[PDB]
mmCIF file of N, CA and C in Angstrom:
data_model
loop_
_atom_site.group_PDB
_atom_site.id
_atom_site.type_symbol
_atom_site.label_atom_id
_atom_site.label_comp_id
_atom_site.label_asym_id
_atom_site.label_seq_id
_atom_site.Cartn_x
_atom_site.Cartn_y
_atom_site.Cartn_z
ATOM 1 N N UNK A 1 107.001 86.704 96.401
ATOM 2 C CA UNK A 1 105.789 87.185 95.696
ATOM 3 C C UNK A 1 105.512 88.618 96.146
ATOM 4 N N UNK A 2 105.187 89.345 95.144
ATOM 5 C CA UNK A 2 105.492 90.867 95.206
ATOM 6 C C UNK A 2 104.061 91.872 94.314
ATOM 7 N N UNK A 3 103.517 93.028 95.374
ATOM 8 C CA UNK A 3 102.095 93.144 95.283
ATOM 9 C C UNK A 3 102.470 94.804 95.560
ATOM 10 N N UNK A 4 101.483 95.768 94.558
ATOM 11 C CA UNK A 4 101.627 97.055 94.935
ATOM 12 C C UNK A 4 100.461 97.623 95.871
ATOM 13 N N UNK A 5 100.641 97.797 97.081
ATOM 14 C CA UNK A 5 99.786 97.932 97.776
ATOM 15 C C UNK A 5 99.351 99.802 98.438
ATOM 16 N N UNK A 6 98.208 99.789 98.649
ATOM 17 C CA UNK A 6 97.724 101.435 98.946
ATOM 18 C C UNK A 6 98.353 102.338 99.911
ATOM 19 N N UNK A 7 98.651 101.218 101.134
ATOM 20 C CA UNK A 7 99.133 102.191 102.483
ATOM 21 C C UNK A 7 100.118 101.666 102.829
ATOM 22 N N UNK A 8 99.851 100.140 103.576
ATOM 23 C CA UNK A 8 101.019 99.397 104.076
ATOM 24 C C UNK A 8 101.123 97.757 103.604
ATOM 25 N N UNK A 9 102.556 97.562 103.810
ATOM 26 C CA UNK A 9 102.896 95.945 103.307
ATOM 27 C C UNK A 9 102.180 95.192 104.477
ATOM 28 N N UNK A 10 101.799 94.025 104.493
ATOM 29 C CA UNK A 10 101.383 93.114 104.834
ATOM 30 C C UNK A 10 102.228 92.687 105.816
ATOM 31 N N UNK A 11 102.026 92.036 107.105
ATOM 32 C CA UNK A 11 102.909 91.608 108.502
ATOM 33 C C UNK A 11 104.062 91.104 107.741
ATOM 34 N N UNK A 12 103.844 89.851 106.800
ATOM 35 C CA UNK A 12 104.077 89.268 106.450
ATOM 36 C C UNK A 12 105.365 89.349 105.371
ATOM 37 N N UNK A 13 105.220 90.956 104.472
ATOM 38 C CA UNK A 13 106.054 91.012 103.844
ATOM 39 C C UNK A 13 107.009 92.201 103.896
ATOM 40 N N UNK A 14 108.029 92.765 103.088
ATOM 41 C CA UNK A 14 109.165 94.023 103.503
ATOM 42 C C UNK A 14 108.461 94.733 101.889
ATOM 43 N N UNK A 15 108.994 96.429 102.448
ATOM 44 C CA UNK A 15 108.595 97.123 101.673
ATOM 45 C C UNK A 15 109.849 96.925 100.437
ATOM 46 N N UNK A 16 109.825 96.722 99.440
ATOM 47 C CA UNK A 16 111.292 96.582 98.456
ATOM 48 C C UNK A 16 111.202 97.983 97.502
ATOM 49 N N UNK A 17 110.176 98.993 97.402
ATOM 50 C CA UNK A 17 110.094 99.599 96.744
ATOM 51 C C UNK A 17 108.863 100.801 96.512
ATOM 52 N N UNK A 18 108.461 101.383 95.373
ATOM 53 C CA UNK A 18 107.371 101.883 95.096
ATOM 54 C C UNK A 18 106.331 101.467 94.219
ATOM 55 N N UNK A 19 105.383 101.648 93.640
ATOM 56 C CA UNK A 19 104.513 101.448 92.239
ATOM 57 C C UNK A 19 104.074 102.794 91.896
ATOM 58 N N UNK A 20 103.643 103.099 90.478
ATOM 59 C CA UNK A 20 102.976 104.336 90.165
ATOM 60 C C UNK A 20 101.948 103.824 89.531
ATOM 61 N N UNK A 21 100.926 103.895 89.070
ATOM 62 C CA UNK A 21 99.493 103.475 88.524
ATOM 63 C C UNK A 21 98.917 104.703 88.403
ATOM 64 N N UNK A 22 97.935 104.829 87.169
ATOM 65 C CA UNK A 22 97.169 105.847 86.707
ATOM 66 C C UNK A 22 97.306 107.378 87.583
ATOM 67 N N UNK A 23 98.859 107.224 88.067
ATOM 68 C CA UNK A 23 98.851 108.396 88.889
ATOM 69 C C UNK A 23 98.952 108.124 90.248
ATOM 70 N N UNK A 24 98.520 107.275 90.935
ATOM 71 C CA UNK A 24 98.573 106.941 92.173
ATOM 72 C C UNK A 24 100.138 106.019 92.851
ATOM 73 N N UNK A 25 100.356 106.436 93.549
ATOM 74 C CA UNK A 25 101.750 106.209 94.141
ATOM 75 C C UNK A 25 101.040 104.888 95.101
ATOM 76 N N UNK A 26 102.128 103.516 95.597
ATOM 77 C CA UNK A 26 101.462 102.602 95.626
ATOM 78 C C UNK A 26 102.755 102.191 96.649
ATOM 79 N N UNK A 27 102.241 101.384 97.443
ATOM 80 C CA UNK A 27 104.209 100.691 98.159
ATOM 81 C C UNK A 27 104.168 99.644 97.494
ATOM 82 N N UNK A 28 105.516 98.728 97.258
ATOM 83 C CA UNK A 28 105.469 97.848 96.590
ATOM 84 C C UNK A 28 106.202 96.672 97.409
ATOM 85 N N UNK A 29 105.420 95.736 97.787
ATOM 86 C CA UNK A 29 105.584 94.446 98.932
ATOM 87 C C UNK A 29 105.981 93.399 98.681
ATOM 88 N N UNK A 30 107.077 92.639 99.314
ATOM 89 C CA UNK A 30 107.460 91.055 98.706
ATOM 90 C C UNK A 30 107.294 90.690 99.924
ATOM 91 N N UNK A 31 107.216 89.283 99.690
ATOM 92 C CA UNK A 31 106.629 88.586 100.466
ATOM 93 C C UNK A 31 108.226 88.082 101.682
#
């Protein structure tokens, strides 16, 4: 399960990527 998040991924999950949203750059987290 995979979430675009502001700063950092969660203990819990690995960074797999990026997100872009209305302009804003995002990390993108799986679980």
């Amino acid at each position: 399960v995979c979430s675009c998040r502001l700063v950092f991924c969660r203990r819990t999950e690995l960074r797999v990527g990026n997100c872009l949203i209305g302009g804003v750059s995002f990390t993108y987290c799986c679980t």
